[PDB]
Amino acid sequence: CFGQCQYTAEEYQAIQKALRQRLGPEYISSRMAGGGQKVCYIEGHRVINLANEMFGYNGWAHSITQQNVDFVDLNNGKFYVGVCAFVRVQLKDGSYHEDVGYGVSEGLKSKALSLEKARKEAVTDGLKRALRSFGNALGNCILDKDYLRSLNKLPRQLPLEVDLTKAKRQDLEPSVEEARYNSC
Amino acid sequence: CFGQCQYTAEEYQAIQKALRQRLGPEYISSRMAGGGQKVCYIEGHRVINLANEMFGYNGWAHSITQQNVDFVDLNNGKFYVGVCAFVRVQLKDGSYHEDVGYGVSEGLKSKALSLEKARKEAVTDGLKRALRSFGNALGNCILDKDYLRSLNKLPRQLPLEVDLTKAKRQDLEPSVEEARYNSC
Amino acid sequence: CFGQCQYTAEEYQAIQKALRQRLGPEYISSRMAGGGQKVCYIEGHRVINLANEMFGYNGWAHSITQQNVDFVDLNNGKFYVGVCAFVRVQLKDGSYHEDVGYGVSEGLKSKALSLEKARKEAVTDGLKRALRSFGNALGNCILDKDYLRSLNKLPRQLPLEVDLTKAKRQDLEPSVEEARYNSC
Amino acid sequence: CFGQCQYTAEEYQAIQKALRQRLGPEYISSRMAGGGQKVCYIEGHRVINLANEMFGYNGWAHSITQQNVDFVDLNNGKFYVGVCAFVRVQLKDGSYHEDVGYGVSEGLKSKALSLEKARKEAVTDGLKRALRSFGNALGNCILDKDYLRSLNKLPRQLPLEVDLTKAKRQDLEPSVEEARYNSC
Amino acid sequence: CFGQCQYTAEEYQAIQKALRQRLGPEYISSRMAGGGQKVCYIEGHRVINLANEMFGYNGWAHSITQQNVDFVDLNNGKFYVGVCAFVRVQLKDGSYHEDVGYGVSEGLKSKALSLEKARKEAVTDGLKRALRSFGNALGNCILDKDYLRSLNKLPRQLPLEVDLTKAKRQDLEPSVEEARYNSC
Amino acid sequence: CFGQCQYTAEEYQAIQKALRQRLGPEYISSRMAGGGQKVCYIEGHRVINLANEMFGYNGWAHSITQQNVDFVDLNNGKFYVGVCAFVRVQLKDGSYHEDVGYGVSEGLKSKALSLEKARKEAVTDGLKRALRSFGNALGNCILDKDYLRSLNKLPRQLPLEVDLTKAKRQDLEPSVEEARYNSC
Amino acid sequence: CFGQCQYTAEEYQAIQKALRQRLGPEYISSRMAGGGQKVCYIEGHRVINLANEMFGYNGWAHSITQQNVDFVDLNNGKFYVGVCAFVRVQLKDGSYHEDVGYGVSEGLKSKALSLEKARKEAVTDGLKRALRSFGNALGNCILDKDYLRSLNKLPRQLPLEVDLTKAKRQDLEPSVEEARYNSC
Amino acid sequence: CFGQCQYTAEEYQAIQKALRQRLGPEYISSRMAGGGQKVCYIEGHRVINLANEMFGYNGWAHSITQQNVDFVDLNNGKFYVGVCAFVRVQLKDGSYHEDVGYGVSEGLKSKALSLEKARKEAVTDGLKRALRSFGNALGNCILDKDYLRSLNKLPRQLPLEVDLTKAKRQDLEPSVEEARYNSC
Amino acid sequence: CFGQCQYTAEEYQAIQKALRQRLGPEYISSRMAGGGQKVCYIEGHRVINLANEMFGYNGWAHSITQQNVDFVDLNNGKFYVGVCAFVRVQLKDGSYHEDVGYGVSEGLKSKALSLEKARKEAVTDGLKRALRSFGNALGNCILDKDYLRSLNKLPRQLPLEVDLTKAKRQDLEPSVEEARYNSC
Amino acid sequence: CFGQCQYTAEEYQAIQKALRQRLGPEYISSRMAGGGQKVCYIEGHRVINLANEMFGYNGWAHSITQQNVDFVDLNNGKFYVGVCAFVRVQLKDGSYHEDVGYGVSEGLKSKALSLEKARKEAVTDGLKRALRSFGNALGNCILDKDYLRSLNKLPRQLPLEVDLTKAKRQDLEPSVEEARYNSC
Amino acid sequence: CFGQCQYTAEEYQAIQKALRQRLGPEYISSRMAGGGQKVCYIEGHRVINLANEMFGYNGWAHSITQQNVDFVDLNNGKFYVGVCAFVRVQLKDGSYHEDVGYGVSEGLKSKALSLEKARKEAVTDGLKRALRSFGNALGNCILDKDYLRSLNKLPRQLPLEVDLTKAKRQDLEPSVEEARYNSC
């Protein structure tokens, strides 16, 4: 099942080796923080892809244990919303890590959009912070000032392009159906 | 059962390969935001079909853990409604992903219709966001801005017209019944 | 038993093929919206029959996990009622889908009738929406605009007349009884 | 045991055949709805008898998961009561269907009689609507407008007179007790 | 035990035959309803005896899931009481049926006696309406208008005079005691 | 254990025969109801003795699932108390019957004595009414008007005398002690 | 364990015989009730001893399910306390009986002493009344008027003098210790 | 373990014999009750010692299921406190007895000391009353007025002086340690 | 594990002998009561050591089932705090004893220190009183007035000095780690 | 799986040796406390890496059992927020340690940011303090004054620069996918 | 697992011997209490190290059952905080001990820092007090006044200087990794 599989020696060794490696400059992006300066981070979908290639689509899971709206205030016609989220990630052997993430909206004149942005940022930040605990290869390096300083002294390479000639254009997946029919 | 089946090697390999692929332009649609620019997304029925072809009609499940109506306000005769939803998707081995979706209604003059639109859009958004977590093939690519600007530089293809000559026209399904009678 | 049977290869393959098919013009009905235009839908009993021929009378189940009366307002002597329902459909292997439905009553002058219409429409809409998630053959086509356009380009066929020469006219069922006596 | 028995092939085939048939004009009855025209339905005991012949006295069960009184109002000395009921039906393999029923009382000058009528009608309506979902043989025909039209073009047969010459006239059931004593 | 004993073929056949039969005129009694005309019914103890002889003293059981005092009102010095009861009957294989009964008290000048009558009549009505669902032989026939009309078309027999020449006159029961001693 | 012994054929047959027997005039006693006339009943300890001799001291059990004090009123210096109880009787195979009893106290001038009488009479009435459901031999006869009218047609026999020459005079009991010692 | 040992034939026969025996005049006492006359009863310790000799020190248990203080009132400087109790007795095969006892104090000028007397008398009365249900030998005789009037027709015997020449004088028990050492 | 060890024949016989014996004058002490006369009782530690020598140090347990502070009131500067306690004793086979004790403090000008006295005396009284129900050898004699009269007519013996020559003077226990080491 | 290890004969005999012994003068200490005289007691760490060497470090356990702060009052600038605790001790075979402890503070001008002293003293007193019930060797002697009299008539020994030349001076415990490594 | 493995002798010995080692100056950082002096600590990602390399990515888990916002105050236009967190770490054999952490914000003029900082710092501090309890190698040495004084008398080495020539630059990881495919 | 691993004989003997040893002066530390004198204690990390080396890093666990903020008062611009904690320690065979600890803060002008100090000190005090109960080697001797007097009669040795030439200076642990790879 899930939560009852135990990693083989080979898979455990491979994952433990892979999780020590640091993220290249391809995975890091920057933001200009309000009142602060350049803050580096890893986008959410990139962390999801890293988790999917590390553990497999069936090797990790995550849930929201609780999400609480901290405050919704109205000042000078603008909405200030702050929302909290607790996200828990589990592996296929039963290993788990749970963390908190926070979502903020300080702008918009519409309450619904503010709450939406806050809640979604909350769950995403919680997922990322909870995945950090498994190792460097999942975002535990963006907190190290050494790796951060060594990134900035590296050439600012252009963002890569995506090729769209072998993309998925039909719903049917012959190999998947053949395997599934043979698995029954 | 469900939740205690385990993927064989062939099926796991197949699904892992198939989930890395990116969606073609057939699946992407666009909107004009409320004060923003072109926002790209995937329709809900499209991601439901993609899930049914990836994991099978018996391979995945999803539930609404919680749904809270954040607010229903009345301003200048018009209703503003914001509703939250937590959706959890599960696979047949026990893997799961839970995310949050938000439904908003802005202009309508009827409280019932606004609440309806909110409650429904909430669950749809939650399902889509929870299915994103399995890989690009289920909507994790629509967030990659590189992928997006790679799509926008392709021609705007025509709307496809679907064949309705072999559509289902009777309730009875001889193959399904003949197969079921032999399972008892 | 239920929840712990697993589909054989033949039945799984048959159902997966049967669910991809689209519905013909016979299953679609139309409404004139309150300010909008032609909205296409599938009547509830039709979806129940489709589910009964897809999975069998014993292959699927459904429950109302929650039903909440959102509002009952009175304006100018007339009642406006809005009710929500959460419906969960489950297959005989443990595969489930849960969705929200909404029932509205706007004009009626009796409160009890309004609540009746609201609650019943809520349960039926929830059932239909939860059945959509199993495939096109259960009502996932009525969201595709391509399918709708291709439907509007077909002739407007006649409503068929049902035959009642072999209808049920006695309570006793000899075959069911002789089969059941041998099951003990 | 109930809930853990599984239908044999013969019994499943027989029941699935017997549930597709439509009800004759015998079972249908009419009402003049408040302000509305002829409404067709099936009396509750008829549906109970049909369920007992289809599945057996031990093949089906039903319970009330919830019953709440929506409102009890007083206007011009007359009472208006609305009651809701959730009824869940189950078979001997685990297959269940749960629906909602509503009872209304807008006449009588006595509160007790009004509440009584409302609650009893609620449970009966819930049972009927839950039994609809198994097939046409249990009342899923009443919604088809084609079947309702085709019924009215049949002759009007006067209700048959039931024979009371072999009715039960003593409590002892010799065959039943002989079988029971042999089953110990 | 109880709830885990499945009927053998002979007992099931016998009970299913015995439950279809209609009650004779010796079981039906009549009241003059308030405003309404003659209302026919079956006394409670008669239904209990019918159930004891259909299924055996150990083949059926019944519980009160909930009893709610709807209202107790005081008008012109007299008490008006209405009470609800939910009664659930279960057989020795797990088959169950749950129904609602209502107790009314209108005229009495003492609150305690009114509440007594209500609470007791509620449970009796619930038990009867629950046992109806097993078949005609337990009171599902008193609702058919055909059977009611055919009853009034029969001669009226004076109540039988019961024989007391072999009534129980000492507590000790030799047969039961010797069987019990041998059962240990 | 209890709730897990199944009656052997001999004991079942014996008890089923014994429960059909009506009670003699020795058991019935009479009261004069307030505002009414002669009401016949069976005293509580007699019903306890009948149950002990039918099923054995280890054959039945009973619990009080609920007891609610309906009201305690003070009028003209006197106390009017009404109390309800729910008693559940269970046999050694798992068969159970649950019923409601009601206790009243109208005249007394001390609150404690009134509540005491109410509670105790409530539990006793509930026990009797729950034991009725097992058959005639446990009090299902006192409701039949035929049996009651037939009882008055019998002579008024003298009150019996109780022999006290073999009464228990010391606590030690050799037979049960030797039997118990041989049981370990 | 306790609660799962089943009586052997010898012990069951012995106990069923021994419980039918009525109590001698040794066990009965007398009180002069306030507002009434001579009431007969059995002291609590006598019933505890009777239970210890009937079933053995390990053959019965009793618990207090609920105890409510019905009222504590103060009138002209004196305290009036009424307290309820629910006591449940259980044998070593799972057979149980539950009863309600009531304690009263209509006297004392101290609240603590009143509450103490009420609570203790409530538990004792509940235990006695719950032990009545096992048979005559445990107090089901004091309710029969025949047995009472047959007792008052007996000579009043002198108070017995207890022998204290072999009373327990040292704590250690050689036989019990030597028995326990051989069990381990 | 504890709660699942059934007594052997020898131990059961021995304990049953030992529990019938009455307690000598060594164990009884007297008090001058407030307003009342001489009241006899057994000190708590003596009852604990008796229970330890009867059932062994590992043969009995006791719990405090509830303890409610009934009242804490202040009059003329002095505190009156009444506290209740529900205590449950259990033997090593599963046999249990639960009773009520009450602690009273009607003197001291300090609230904490009065509450302490009340609570501790309450638990002690509950334990003594619960151990009474096992037999005379544990305090069921102090309620028999015959035994009390027989005690008061014995010579008032002197307080025994305890020998302290073999008292425990070092914590280590050679025999217990050797046995425990050999247990592993 | 714990609570599932029965004592062997040797260990049970050893502990039962050891628990009967009384404590010497080396364990008793004295206090001057608040308005009384010499009160004798045993310090907490002493009973902890006695329990450790009686039952072993892995042979007994204790929990605080409930701690309730009874009162915190401020009078004339000083704090009066009274706190209750319920302590439960359990041996390795499942035997347990639960008692109440009380902590008092009628002094200090600081609220935090008062509550601290109260809570800690409460838990310690509860532990000591709970350990009393296992026998004399754990503090069931400080309640016997005969033993207290016999203590004071024995010479007062001056406090012993503690050898501190083999005290623990490094964390490492070679024998413990050798055994722990061999235990894997 | 997790929570149910047991360390082999070799792994247990290795970890017990590794946990006693003290951390070098590489891991320690310093802060200037408000009004205080230099405080030494270990950053969060460092202790996460230490735990990942001690026990493995699958050998430890941590959860947030509770997080409560102690206070959110607004003084002179600035926000002061204090939040608590309870973090529980668990090893793969079932060993666990739970400890409290606290997050503080005393500055910022934005409420959402202050709550964010408080919550995140709280969870991190709790995780660190819970990991301390496993030994010095996880941050139990930063509390020793001797070790801290020995650190400051050691040369201050320049911050190590991180090399990025072998950093992870692609999502796919051939080794782990091959091992996982062989693990099915 | 953990909680079900019984100690072998050798390890039990070793730990029991080692837990009796009193701690040396190298472990004791001193404070100057407010209003009092020299108080002796053991720093928290010392007790954690002693527990790690007695039982192993996997031999003991601890949890916070409850933490309650007793009071947060503000007097003359300074904060007075008192908090409670219940800490439960458990060994690997199921043996547990639970004790209360208290945290005080009567200084600082900042509420956040006060609550922080209080809560952390409370958890640490609870852990120390709960570990005391296992023996002297974990801080029980710190309460014996004889040992405290004997400490001051011993030369005041200077605190040791810690060696940092074998400190951990890289995260990777070869021995642990080899063992873990061979344990899969």
Side-chain angles (χ1 to χ4, degrees), chain E residues 1-168:
Chain E
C1 295
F2 194 80
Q4 311 164 10
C5 183
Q6 68 274 17
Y7 293 93
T8 52
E10 284 87 21
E11 187 173 10
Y12 152 75
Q13 197 177 223
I15 293 192
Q16 182 81 347
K17 283 185 179 303
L19 278 176
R20 286 196 281 258
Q21 317 183 231
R22 297 187 159 90
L23 275 300
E26 69 178 6
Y27 290 85
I28 311 291
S29 63
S30 296
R31 298 141 38 187
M32 294 297 173
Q37 201 58 254
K38 185 180 290 293
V39 176
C40 295
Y41 74 111
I42 307 188
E43 291 291 330
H45 63 280
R46 282 251 181 72
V47 179
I48 285 181
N49 270 326
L50 274 169
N52 284 326
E53 199 68 28
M54 278 292 316
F55 313 125
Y57 76 98
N58 56 333
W60 75 286
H62 87 94
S63 72
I64 299 162
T65 298
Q66 172 173 9
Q67 177 153 252
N68 193 359
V69 185
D70 266 6
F71 74 97
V72 49
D73 293 354
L74 187 53
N75 179 337
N76 195 0
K78 303 171 177 183
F79 276 96
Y80 300 85
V81 179
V83 169
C84 182
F86 298 91
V87 179
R88 151 165 176 149
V89 179
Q90 178 183 31
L91 295 193
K92 80 180 182 184
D93 76 319
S95 300
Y96 59 91
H97 292 93
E98 172 194 329
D99 219 351
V100 62
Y102 208 81
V104 176
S105 178
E106 292 289 326
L108 301 176
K109 293 183 185 293
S110 73
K111 175 148 56 178
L113 273 66
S114 294
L115 270 155
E116 182 185 26
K117 197 192 167 198
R119 305 293 276 269
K120 297 186 172 183
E121 173 174 10
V123 179
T124 305
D125 213 28
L127 184 66
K128 286 192 295 191
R129 287 178 43 91
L131 280 168
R132 281 181 188 169
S133 296
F134 283 103
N136 296 332
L138 291 174
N140 200 24
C141 64
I142 61 170
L143 296 174
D144 180 2
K145 300 287 99 175
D146 284 347
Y147 168 85
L148 286 194
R149 281 191 302 101
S150 181
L151 268 180
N152 289 319
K153 295 182 184 292
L154 291 176
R156 280 81 64 194
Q157 184 35 251
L158 202 157
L160 295 173
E161 292 186 349
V162 178
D163 181 353
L164 291 174
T165 194
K166 297 295 182 183
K168 174 191 270 303

Side-chain angles (χ1 to χ4, degrees), chain G residues 52-129:
Chain G
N52 286 328
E53 294 297 324
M54 277 296 314
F55 308 111
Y57 79 96
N58 55 354
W60 70 289
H62 85 103
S63 179
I64 309 172
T65 301
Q66 176 183 200
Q67 180 170 2
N68 298 115
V69 181
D70 271 17
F71 73 99
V72 53
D73 299 351
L74 184 60
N75 186 339
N76 65 288
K78 303 174 179 184
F79 273 97
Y80 304 81
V81 176
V83 173
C84 163
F86 300 85
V87 184
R88 167 189 165 112
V89 183
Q90 180 185 14
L91 296 190
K92 77 177 185 183
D93 75 319
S95 300
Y96 52 91
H97 287 102
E98 203 165 341
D99 187 84
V100 59
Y102 210 81
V104 182
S105 48
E106 301 285 320
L108 323 171
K109 292 176 69 68
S110 61
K111 176 147 59 180
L113 274 66
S114 296
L115 271 161
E116 175 183 19
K117 196 200 166 198
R119 300 185 103 113
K120 301 189 167 175
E121 174 174 20
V123 176
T124 304
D125 189 278
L127 180 65
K128 288 193 297 175
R129 278 179 40 99

Side-chain angles (χ1 to χ4, degrees), chain J residues 130-164:
Chain J
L131 277 161
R132 291 179 183 169
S133 306
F134 290 106
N136 298 328
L138 285 176
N140 197 22
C141 49
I142 62 170
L143 296 174
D144 180 2
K145 294 312 171 213
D146 292 330
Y147 164 86
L148 284 191
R149 274 183 322 95
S150 67
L151 272 179
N152 288 320
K153 63 177 71 175
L154 210 60
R156 175 56 284 180
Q157 177 47 240
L158 274 295
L160 181 63
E161 61 89 20
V162 176
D163 178 50
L164 289 169

Side-chain angles (χ1 to χ4, degrees), chain J residues 6 20 54 70 149, chain K residues 1 53 119 161 168 180:
Chain J
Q6 280 179 171
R20 288 196 284 256
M54 280 295 312
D70 268 359
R149 274 183 322 95
Chain K
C1 190
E53 201 68 29
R119 299 180 105 110
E161 271 316 280
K168 187 174 181 179
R180 216 179 312 135

Side-chain angles (χ1 to χ4, degrees), chain C residues 61-85:
Chain C
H62 83 92
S63 71
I64 304 161
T65 78
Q66 187 184 16
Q67 175 160 253
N68 190 359
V69 189
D70 286 359
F71 71 96
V72 192
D73 292 332
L74 180 59
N75 178 304
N76 183 207
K78 303 170 176 182
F79 272 94
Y80 303 86
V81 176
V83 172
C84 68

Side-chain angles (χ1 to χ4, degrees), chain F residues 168-171, chain G residues 23-29 41-42 46 50:
Chain F
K168 165 191 274 282
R169 295 191 131 77
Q170 50 99 31
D171 291 331
Chain G
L23 292 191
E26 293 96 332
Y27 297 75
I28 308 290
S29 297
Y41 75 107
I42 310 177
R46 282 256 173 70
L50 271 167

